[PDB]
Ligand binder design. Structure first.
Ligand SMILES: *C(#N)C1=NC(N2[C][C][N][C][C]2)=NC([N][C]2[C][C][C][C][C]2)=N1
Length: 215
């Protein structure tokens, strides 16, 4: 263990989920960050509801994509977000079914990492916890990733098409990286995660759309 951190070993990360056919990566990413702050603030965490966000964040497009900051704003204005148990994931948008009795967390706003600043993202991951981020995950090599530290210069930092969650950082075999939680199931990548090159010119745009909720 070098100059690094891995929140999976600290109870700040819930099990890896599978968004299914639905383009809800942004909802899983948002919930992931919210869950981390729930643990930081209260000492306990709980699977929050991605469906709640898919069905109720009108500024977003449901299974057609969306932004994490919009989700954080919703939780704030809504005065809460339901737990997974109270508002189960069905993988398809349905009418907003938010129920305050199932509230499991709330937030008072959010902060965005300065665009392209990986040092700032590193500081946020160390001082805040899991951070919602967006990347270019369109490359076939990204999708079939299995191990090691992913680095492909063909990645387009101007084409963020998938939202994920930075749950740590460190170094493998001399290769600095970010520990990334995806939402394509535990069967994807390495147990649901991917190690992405860190301090390599903001590879794949990892620090271009990073944010976290405030509690
Ligand atoms: C996720 N999952 C996710 N899915 C989509 N789409 C739209 C195009 N067709 C597939 C489903 N879109 C987005 N948008 C985000 C990309 C990363 C930056 C914030 C928006 N996410």
């Amino acid at each position: 263990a070098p100059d690094s951190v891995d929140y999976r070993k600290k109870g700040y990360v819930t099990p890896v989920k599978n968004q299914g056919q639905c383009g809800s990566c942004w909802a899983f990413s948002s919930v992931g960050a919210l869950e981390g702050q729930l643990k930081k603030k209260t000492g306990k965490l709980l699977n929050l509801s991605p469906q709640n966000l898919v069905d109720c964040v009108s500024e977003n497009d449901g299974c057609g994509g969306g932004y994490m900051t919009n989700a954080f704003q919703y939780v704030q204005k809504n005065r809460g977000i339901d737990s997974e148990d109270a508002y189960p994931y069905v993988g398809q948008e349905e009418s907003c079914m938010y129920n305050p009795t199932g509230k499991a967390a709330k937030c008072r706003g959010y902060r965005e990492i300065p665009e392209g600043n990986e040092k700032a993202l590193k500081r946020a991951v160390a001082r805040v916890g899991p951070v919602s981020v967006a990347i270019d995950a369109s490359l076939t090599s990204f999708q079939f990733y299995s191990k090691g530290v992913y680095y492909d210069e063909s990645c387009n930092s101007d084409n963020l098409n998938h939202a994920v969650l930075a749950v740590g950082y460190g170094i493998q075999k001399g290769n600095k990286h970010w520990i990334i939680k995806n939402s394509w199931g535990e069967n994807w990548g390495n147990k649901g995660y991917i190690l992405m090159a860190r301090n390599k010119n903001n590879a794949c745009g990892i620090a271009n759309l990073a944010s976290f909720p405030k509690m």
